[PDB]
Each structure stands twice: as C-alpha cells, then as structure tokens.
Amino acid sequence: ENGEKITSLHREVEKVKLDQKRLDQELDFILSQQKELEDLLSPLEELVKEQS
Amino acid sequence: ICQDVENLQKFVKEQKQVQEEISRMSSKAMLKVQEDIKALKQLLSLAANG
Numbered sequence: 324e325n326g327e328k329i330t331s332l333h334r335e336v337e338k339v340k341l342d343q344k345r346l347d348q349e350l351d352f353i354l355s356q357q358k359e360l361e362d363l364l365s366p367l368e369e370l371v372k373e374q375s
Numbered sequence: 376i377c378q379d380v381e382n383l384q385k386f387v388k389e390q391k392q393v394q395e396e397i398s399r400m401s402s403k404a405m406l407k408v409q410e411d412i413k414a415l416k417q418l419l420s421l422a423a424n425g
Contacts, residue, residue: 325408325412328412328416333418335423
C-alpha cells in the first residue's frame with residue numbers, strides 16, 4: 324500500500340528533475356542573452372562616439 | 376510410552392519456542408514507513424510548487 328506511493332513518488336521526482344534541469348541550463352542561456360546584448364550595446368558606444 | 380511423552384511434549388514445546396521467537400520479533404519499523412512516505416510526498420509537493 325505504501326510501496327505504490329513510493330512509485331508515484333519516484334515518478335513525479337525525476338519529472339521534477341527533468342524540471343529543474345531544464346530551468347537550469349534556461350537561466351544560463353537568458354543569462355547569456357544578457358552578456359551579448361551587453362558587450363554589444365557597445366560596442367554601439369562606435370557608432371554613437373563617432374557620430375558625436 | 377513414557378519415553379514417549381518425554382519427546383512429544385518436547386517437540387511440541389520446541390515449537391512453542393519458535394512461537395515465542397516470532398513473538399519476540401514484532402513492528403514499529405513498519406509503522407514508521409507510512410509516516411515517512413506520507414512526509415516525502417509532501418516535500419515533493421513543495422519542490423513542485425517551488
């Protein structure tokens with residue numbers, strides 16, 4: 324009777340870890356959008372001190 | 376015949392020993408389990424809600 328619960332515990336646990344992984348690598352990547360979109364707001368600091 | 380009762384009561388009693396033996400052996404370990412899985416299930420709900 325307990326063993327069964329154990330089962331849908333295992334279940335739903337590794338689908339939680341499918342979860343987190345994912346959200347994990349997600350946060351890297353939203354994170355990388357933040358390193359790129361930054362270097363290059365400037366190198367947009369050329370294009371704008373040139374105009375100047 | 377009274378060799379005899381020396382043995383039979385003896386094999387019977389030998390058996391009561393095992394009965395005692397099982398009696399000695401009894402559960403709390405078991406009772407413990409439902410409590411834990413009931414508990415682990417709950418933490419899983421946490422993590423999930425998190």
